[PDB]
Amino acid sequence: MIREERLLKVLRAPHVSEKASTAMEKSNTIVLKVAKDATKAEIKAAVQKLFEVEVEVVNTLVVKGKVKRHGQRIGRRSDWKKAYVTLKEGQNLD
Amino acid sequence: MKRTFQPSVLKRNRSHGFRARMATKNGRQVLARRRAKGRARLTVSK
Amino acid sequence: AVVKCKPTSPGRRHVVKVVNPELHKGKPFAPLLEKNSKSGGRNNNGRITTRHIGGGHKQAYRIVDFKRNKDGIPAVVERLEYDPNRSANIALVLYKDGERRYILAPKGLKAGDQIQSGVDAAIKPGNTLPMRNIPVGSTVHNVEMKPGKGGQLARSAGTYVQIVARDGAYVTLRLRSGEMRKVEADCRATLGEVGNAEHMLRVLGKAGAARWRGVRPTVRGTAMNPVDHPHGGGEGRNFGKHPVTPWGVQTKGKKTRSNKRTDKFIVRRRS
RNA sequence: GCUCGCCGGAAGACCAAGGGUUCCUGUCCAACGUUAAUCGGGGCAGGGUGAGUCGACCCCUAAGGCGAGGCCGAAAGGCGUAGUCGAUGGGAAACAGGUUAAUAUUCCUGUACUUGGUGUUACUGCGAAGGGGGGACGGAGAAGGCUAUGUUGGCCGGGCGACGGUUGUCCCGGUUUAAGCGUGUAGGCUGGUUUUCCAGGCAAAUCCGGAAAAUCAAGGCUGAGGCGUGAUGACGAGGCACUACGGUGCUGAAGCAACAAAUGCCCUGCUUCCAGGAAAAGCCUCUAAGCAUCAGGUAACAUCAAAUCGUACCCCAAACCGACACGGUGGUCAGGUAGAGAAUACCAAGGCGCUUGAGAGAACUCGGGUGAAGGAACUAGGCAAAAUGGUGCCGUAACUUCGGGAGAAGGCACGCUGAUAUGUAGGUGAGGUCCCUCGCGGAUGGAGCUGAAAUCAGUCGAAGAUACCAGCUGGCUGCAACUGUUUAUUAAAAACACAGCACUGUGCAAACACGAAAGUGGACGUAUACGGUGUGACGCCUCCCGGUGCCGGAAGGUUAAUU
RNA sequence: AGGACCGAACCGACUAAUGAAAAAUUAGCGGAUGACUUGUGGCUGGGGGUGAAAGGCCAAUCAAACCGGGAGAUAGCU
C-alpha cells in the first residue's frame, strides 16, 4: 500500500524517443522518467492509479548524467531513472 | 614496463579513503588540515 | 627402515628416506584435526621474530593427547599415523567407551595393542601412570613437569627419560640432554620410549627438502656488510672478531640461562 | 566497389581490473590528429545501458582488520576476549531462437526452473546460541569411457564452365537445433536390514561412536555421455515480392551415417608418493529448555514474491598503467592442411595495411642476400657471421659417485609411383544369428569406415629431414659439487644459498627476537627439538691456551651504594 | 620416480648490433613439475622494515624514503 501523495510524486514525465515510440507501438510498453528513489512496485502503483491502466511489469534503469562543457567550465548533468512499463494486452494509453 | 601506479579502487579506498582517515587520530588531523586549507576533494573518495 | 635413494639425479643422490610401512595410508581422523596456519616466524607486531621460518607445506593440526586422563578405561590401538607437526608418529586409539584419541606412538606399539592410564594400570609400554607408581630405573616418555598439566619432556621421535631416584615427594629424572631434574612424584608419565627412533637417520639430500619443511635459507653474518651483522664487511674474507649473534652477544660458549625461579629443581646441569 | 598485401594460440572473439560516455545518429572542421581531411576516440546537439535465474548486494567464513568489558601504557595509545567485519574461496534457480542505429541468458517468441511466504485440505512431535554428519579439499601418474570439434561418405539445393578437357570416382554450398523433464548407462564408493546394551560426543539424545546378537547377498549413494522427449516447432542453402539501395516482408529442401578426437567432462574418481594437503555457513540429522491437543513440522494445491544497484563502449589497448593516438597488463574461447605440438609455414571465421606523401636510385649509416682463390692470416678474444640441426636403425672412448659420461664421436636410410595388400598389420564396429535376471544387457558375427610401418620393383631431380622449423663437435685445464639466488637501470660470477659437517647455547613461563608494558613469535614445538655461529655434496683427511675472548674456581689482594 | 632431459606458453636477461622507449629492439640465449610461476586481498615503516646478502629493495628517489615543520640551520667558501 503506497500513499497517494507519494505516488503522485513518483512519476516525472513521459520519455519521447524513437525507441520509446517503438516500444509503445509494438510491445505495448510505455517509457517514463521517474523519481530516482522510486522503486518498481511504487512506479507500477502510480501508473495504475494515475493513468488508470493495468500493468503487466515494470523494468527500470538508471541513466547516468553526461559531462558537458559550457564554455570553459566543466559540468555534469543529473542522473535519472527510466522505466519501461509494460501494459497488459489491449490496454490503450492516452 | 610495469610502472609504479597500478590502480585498484578497493585498495585505494582502504588505503586512503574517508573511513580509513577517520579511523585514526592522525588521519583525522590530516582531514582537518585539508578542510582548513579549503580542499574541494577532502579525500580520495569519489 | 632407512632407504638410500639411487642417484638418478643430483639432488636425489644423497637422499635417505625413512619409510615405515605400518603407518596409515589414508586421511587422518577428521574430528581430531584442526586448522593451523603458518606464521612465517612473525609476531603480532608483524615483525620477523625468528629468522629462517617460512613457506613449507600446508599442515593440519592433529590434536594429540599429552594430558592422558582416561583413567581405568582400557584403550586399543587402531593405527599409527603420520603427523606432520612432529618428529614422532602418533597412534589413533579407541577407548572401550567409544571415544578416540591421538597419542604419541611409543617404541613397540602397533595396531591391536592395549594401553591404559591410571594409578592401577600395568607397567607396560604405552601405559600411563604417576611417577610415584612407576618403578625406579624405568624408561618413560611424555613426562609432566607440573601435575595435571600435560606431558612436556621427552616427546621427540626417539627420546625417553630415566627415573634415577624417588626421594619423598619428588623424583629425579635424567633428561635426554643429560640434565638431572627433580619433578613432583605425582606428575604423570608414559612407559617406554617414544616411537620413531630412526627419524635422525633421514637425510634431506637437497635444498628443496629443507624448504618443504618450512625452513628458509640462512645467510652467514660474515657474508654481510657491517651495517647488517657484527661479522660483516672486510675486503675478501675477513673475520677478526669473537663470534656473536646478529645482536652482538657471544655465540660460542656463553651461557644464557637466567631463570632463578627453577634453579632449585635442576639437580645437575648437562655436559 | 573490384584487385593486392598482412595477422589468424592473433594484429580474431568474450570478460575481469582500470577507465567513465570513448557506444549510436545527425551535424561542424577554428583548435586537437605529427600532412590533407569531407573523416575521427576532436567540437555541438540528440539518443542509448530493461534481469526472480548473469554479477554485486545477501548468507558463510580465510589471511587479516576493528574490538564492549578486559590487561597494559606519562598522554596520545598498544594488545586482545565476547563479538563484529573481511574474497581471492563455500552457499537456490534459464535455455534456444528473433530483434535495435546503438541493450540483451535483461526486450519479444517458445519452452523451463528456484525459495520464500500467505491460504489449504491431509497428517501429527515440533523445538537451539547445543550434539553428530556433511560441506571438506595435496602433488604426480595412468589409463578407460565420453563429448566439444573436425574429416569423409550419404542426402538436399545449385552448377556444366572467359583457355585444351570437364554429365562424372566431376565442381560450390548446406546438412544446425538448447536448458529442462524422463531414462540412471561406462564407470567409482561402500556390505545392508533389524534387535539389544554402553564410564564416549560439556546436559539430553530415537543421531553419531563403541560393543554384542540375528538374518539377507543385494542395499544404498555417486555418475559423464548416449537415447527419448523438448521440436507438427525454431533455424536453414538460397529462391521470391517491395526498395528511402541501408534493407524490409513472404518463403523455405535436406537436416543422416561412419570414422577421428581433446589439455574439456566422468574425475572432489582411481593408483601412487611424502613434503601429509583451509574455514564456516547453506544442507541432512539428534535431541534440550520449551509448548501440549495450539503452534510448528511434510503433503500436495492455489495464489502472491523475488526489492535494490551494475548492464553502453574500450579491455594485450588510440579508451587501462607508461606526460603523447608512445613497453606493461589476469582469465575464457582455440577451425583447416602439413606437424610430436598451443612450435613453424600457408589459410578460415573475423580483423587490419600500422594518419605524412611523391620522386630519385650518390657518399655514408641501418637491416638483409651472394661471392673467385685462400680459411682465423682478423681480433684482447673466432666478437659477429658461417656451420650443425629431424625420425628410424647401426655404432659409441677415457673417466665414473656405476646413475652416468651419451644425442659422446661417427655413419647409413629418407621423395613420388606400383606391387606385396583393387588398403596390409592394427583400430573401430552395423545388420544377421543365439542367450537373457529384459536393458543404455551379454555372446557370436564380421559389413562398412579408418589406417600406420615395412619390403621388393620402377621413376624424376644437381639436390627427397628439399621450404619454415631444427644440437656445432672433440681434447687439456682453473673455480664452484649439483638445480637454484643476486647489484630493478653498466657486474650473473669464482659472490649468496644449498644438502652435509662441526661448535655453542637452550629443561620449557626454553634460549632468542619484536614490544617502557601487556602480550606475541619461537611452538599449540619439548633436546632425534629450537636458536646462533662457522664450514659447505661425496672421497681421503683435518703442533701452540703466551695474547684477546669464553667456561669453571674462589684462598688472598683491591673494590660501590650503605654505615 | 626426478629441485631428471629436449622444447612453446609463462618467468628470466648471457652475447650482439641498433630514443618508438627516463633501460627498449631485433637476432640468438637460461629456466620451464619447481628452492617454479601468476591473479586477488592481507601484514611488516625509516636507524625502521625486508634482504638465498648486491648496501639490494622500500612508488623513475636510498650508506638511512617522502611530505610538512624547527628554518631565513650554518657557509672563515663561490
Side-chain angles (χ1 to χ4, degrees):
Chain A
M1 222 300 122
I2 304 82
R3 195 149 156 202
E4 290 181 298
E5 176 165 315
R6 180 43 202 280
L7 283 180
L8 290 147
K9 290 182 172 188
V10 160
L11 293 177
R12 289 293 94 182
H15 185 57
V16 316
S17 157
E18 190 193 65
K19 178 169 188 182
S21 304
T22 304
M24 245 211 267
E25 100 179 26
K26 275 188 200 191
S27 302
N28 203 344
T29 296
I30 47 174
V31 187
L32 311 155
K33 193 185 291 315
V34 305
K36 202 174 189 302
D37 93 302
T39 187
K40 268 172 184 174
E42 276 180 344
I43 283 160
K44 174 166 155 181
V47 166
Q48 278 182 350
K49 199 193 172 210
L50 273 48
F51 292 65
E52 296 122 38
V53 66
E54 287 185 308
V55 169
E56 194 166 11
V57 64
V58 179
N59 284 207
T60 55
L61 64 78
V62 176
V63 181
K64 311 305 183 283
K66 284 183 176 173
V67 171
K68 295 280 169 172
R69 293 182 61 78
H70 190 86
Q72 282 182 320
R73 215 175 272 121
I74 198 173
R76 195 151 177 288
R77 292 158 175 218
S78 285
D79 294 11
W80 63 273
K81 201 165 185 173
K82 194 170 172 171
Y84 294 92
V85 184
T86 307
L87 307 164
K88 289 190 191 176
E89 60 187 308
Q91 284 293 355
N92 198 69
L93 224 199
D94 64 320
Chain B
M1 305 182 68
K2 191 187 187 191
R3 285 280 126 78
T4 52
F5 187 61
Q6 295 285 331
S8 182
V9 174
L10 168 75
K11 219 186 282 190
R12 157 152 273 223
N13 278 331
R14 282 185 176 175
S15 186
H16 304 305
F18 177 83
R19 295 202 87 250
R21 288 276 141 88
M22 234 50 197
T24 177
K25 183 268 289 181
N26 283 310
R28 274 198 290 290
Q29 275 193 330
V30 155
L31 283 203
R33 272 215 301 286
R34 285 184 83 75
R35 280 219 184 74
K37 185 128 167 167
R39 288 303 184 172
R41 291 76 138 285
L42 204 269
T43 43
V44 183
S45 276
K46 296 265 286 182
Chain C
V2 302
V3 182
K4 182 91 188 168
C5 295
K6 294 196 164 191
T8 52
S9 48
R12 212 75 162 76
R13 173 168 255 116
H14 300 295
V15 173
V16 169
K17 295 177 154 186
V18 168
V19 176
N20 186 20
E22 303 262 61
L23 291 189
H24 180 54
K25 292 179 175 177
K27 301 296 173 190
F29 194 64
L32 284 173
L33 295 187
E34 92 167 47
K35 183 182 125 225
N36 177 46
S37 183
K38 297 177 167 293
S39 156
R42 292 158 160 84
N43 72 341
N44 61 13
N45 290 338
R47 302 290 194 73
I48 285 167
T49 53
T50 159
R51 283 111 54 74
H52 318 324
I53 301 177
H57 203 290
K58 184 137 67 181
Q59 296 168 329
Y61 185 67
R62 316 307 194 271
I63 292 160
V64 167
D65 168 27
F66 299 104
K67 269 218 279 188
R68 193 70 188 286
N69 312 322
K70 282 266 189 198
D71 300 346
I73 306 154
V76 53
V77 175
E78 293 215 292
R79 63 191 189 210
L80 310 185
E81 272 191 34
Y82 181 88
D83 189 357
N85 295 282
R86 54 182 86 267
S87 75
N89 278 129
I90 63 180
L92 184 63
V93 320
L94 181 52
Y95 287 93
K96 259 57 178 177
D97 66 0
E99 187 165 330
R100 318 193 149 69
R101 269 125 172 264
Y102 284 132
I103 69 175
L104 268 34
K107 199 174 161 185
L109 202 81
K110 57 192 179 188
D113 287 32
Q114 276 210 47
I115 63 176
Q116 197 162 37
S117 29
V119 165
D120 65 324
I123 297 150
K124 94 178 236 309
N127 286 36
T128 297
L129 42 141
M131 281 181 290
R132 57 179 52 265
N133 301 128
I134 289 167
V136 171
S138 61
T139 54
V140 242
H141 69 293
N142 190 60
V143 185
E144 295 191 330
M145 289 166 132
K146 284 191 170 190
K149 197 163 169 181
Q152 280 185 282
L153 313 153
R155 273 124 123 281
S156 201
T159 59
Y160 62 94
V161 194
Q162 273 156 246
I163 306 189
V164 302
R166 162 158 69 252
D167 51 307
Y170 288 83
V171 307
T172 303
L173 284 314
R174 204 202 294 283
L175 298 199
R176 202 71 183 73
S177 56
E179 184 145 319
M180 286 266 217
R181 198 192 195 285
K182 244 140 183 160
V183 161
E184 291 172 48
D186 254 301
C187 294
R188 225 145 181 89
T190 307
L191 272 305
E193 270 150 295
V194 95
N196 185 25
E198 66 183 343
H199 164 83
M200 63 174 169
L201 280 349
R202 88 199 344 294
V203 32
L204 274 15
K206 57 164 189 183
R211 297 314 301 270
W212 298 337
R213 293 144 166 91
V215 177
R216 299 197 75 248
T218 301
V219 180
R220 305 174 342 270
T222 194
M224 306 182 168
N225 294 313
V227 75
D228 313 310
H229 200 280
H231 291 174
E235 291 281 293
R237 305 197 173 99
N238 298 343
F239 189 74
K241 33 235 170 184
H242 303 109
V244 280
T245 56
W247 309 283
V249 181
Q250 189 84 24
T251 50
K252 300 282 173 43
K254 190 215 195 303
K255 295 171 165 68
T256 75
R257 161 167 247 253
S258 183
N259 196 230
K260 220 138 61 174
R261 174 182 89 259
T262 64
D263 271 325
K264 69 191 165 217
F265 300 136
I266 311 318
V267 172
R268 211 202 315 98
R269 301 280 290 158
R270 61 123 215 301
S271 294

